[PDB]
Amino acid sequence: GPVPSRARVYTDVNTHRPSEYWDYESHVVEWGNQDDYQLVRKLGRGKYSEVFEAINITNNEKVVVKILKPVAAAKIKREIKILENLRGGPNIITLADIVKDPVSRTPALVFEHVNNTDFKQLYQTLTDYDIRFYMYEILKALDYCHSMGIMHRDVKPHNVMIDHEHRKLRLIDWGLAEFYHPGQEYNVRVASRYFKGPELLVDYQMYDYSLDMWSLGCMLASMIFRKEPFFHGHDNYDQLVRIAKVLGTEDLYDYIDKYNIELDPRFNDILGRHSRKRWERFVHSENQHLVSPEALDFLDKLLRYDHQSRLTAREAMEHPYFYTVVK
Ligand SMILES: COc1cc(Nc2ncc3c(C)nc(-c4cc5ccccc5[nH]4)n3n2)cc(OC)c1OC
């Protein structure tokens, strides 16, 4: 069967913590007053919640209320524990309150509001310096949560709020986040298609923090090459084929061989034989100002099939690509 795997960093952080830290099922939720918040407008809705802009009438501050649909109402304790564990952390969204929605009768998480610029619009105007600055800000969040024994598992542009005016960034939507425990087999049905790591696409369940570093690599590829998303698969099978057309099939077979993974037999007719592409193939007159040797070296160290070979968030922050960013 598959060869086991463990994170190369923050491996045992949860076992050295009291069970109260990671045993989210035993958590007793402290409830606030729903009357403190007046709903203003619906911002969106996913398959697990409805999101509203609201006003906290006790301080007139703008907030965001995530009302859980009963499908996620079930595993709310996990999200709440993770948000309370990470509160105050660099660039982590602040959970301000937990109230019971009087209409859905489900939990409603109250968060700080970010004056976000739609990523589709914002990514088009980002400069080489802005990409490096924002990537460093995301890394602070990722290294903090990883150091706290938590995997985000849904890193993507939609979950990175950017107030471009104040150059402020928050990592949001911790609904898929999980505590990392060495040797645990996790659900591969996490992240969004374009940012799923090869470990999810090949059904390797013993993954870790490094999954978020593949997702970050995809975001960086989209920003520097001005192609969003960079890997545009039609489904989870074609997603891996899109990856293999860039990284090659030989490194993919070496990765499955190393972990003793049996590739789904449907891949035999669609995968083909591809060699790795040099990153300059993706450079053209329209994105050349965002591409540098440091950017390509950094991307190359994030977009690796072998999750154990990817840069850690702390290692990524030490990379030369961030030397020009003011610290
Ligand atoms: C002022 O305009 C905005 C403000 C915000 N603010 C924001 N601040 C915090 C926060 C949190 C914790 N969750 C969401 C959020 C917004 C949203 C929209 C659709 C689906 C899920 C969503 N989640 N947000 N959104 C978001 C916006 O678009 C995503 C946005 O429109 C561009």
The DSSP annotation for 271-298 comes to ----PPPPGGGG--TTTGGG--HHHHHH
Report the DSSP pairing between strands 168-171 and 160-163.
antiparallel
Helix (H, G, I), strand (E, B) or coil at 56: strand
Summarize the annotated binding site for ATP as residue ranges: 43-51, 66
Residue 87 tokens read as 């509160």
CATH architecture assignment, domain 119-322: Orthogonal Bundle (1.10)
Measured from the CA of 43, which atom of ligand 1 is nearest?
18
Q: How far is CA 55 from the centre of its chain?
A: 28
Helix (H, G, I), strand (E, B) or coil at 38: strand
Instruction: Give me ligand 1 centre to Cα 158, in Å.
Output: 9
Ligand 1 contact, 172 CB (< 6 A): yes
Pick from 246, 252, 240: nearest CA to 296: 246
Evaluated on CA atoms 52, 57, 58, 62, the torsion sign reads positive
Ligand 1 contact, 83 CB (< 6 A): no
What's the rounded Cα separation, in Å, for the pair 38 and 165? 26
For 69-106, b/e burial (b = at least 16 CB within 10 A) is eeebeebbbbbbbbbebbeebbbbbebbbbbebeeeeb
Catalytic residue, candidates 97, 143, 154, 208 = 154
Ligand 1 contact, 93 CB (< 6 A): yes
Ligand 1 contact, 116 CB (< 6 A): yes
Question: Any catalytic annotation for residue 12?
Answer: no
Ligand 1 contact, 43 CB (< 6 A): yes
Instruction: Give me ligand 1 centre to Cα 116, in Å.
Output: 7
Method: X-ray
Evaluated on CA atoms 146, 149, 153, 159, the torsion sign reads negative
What's the rounded Cα separation, in Å, for the pair 176 and 163? 24
**Are 190 and 176 in contact, with CB atoms under 8 Å apart?**
yes
Q: Whose CA is nearest to atom 20 of ligand 1?
A: 44
DSSP 231: S
Mutating to test ligand 1, I would choose from 161, 173, 174, 176 the residue with most ligand atoms within 8 A of its C-beta, which is: 161
Q: What is the resolution of this structure in A?
A: 1.5
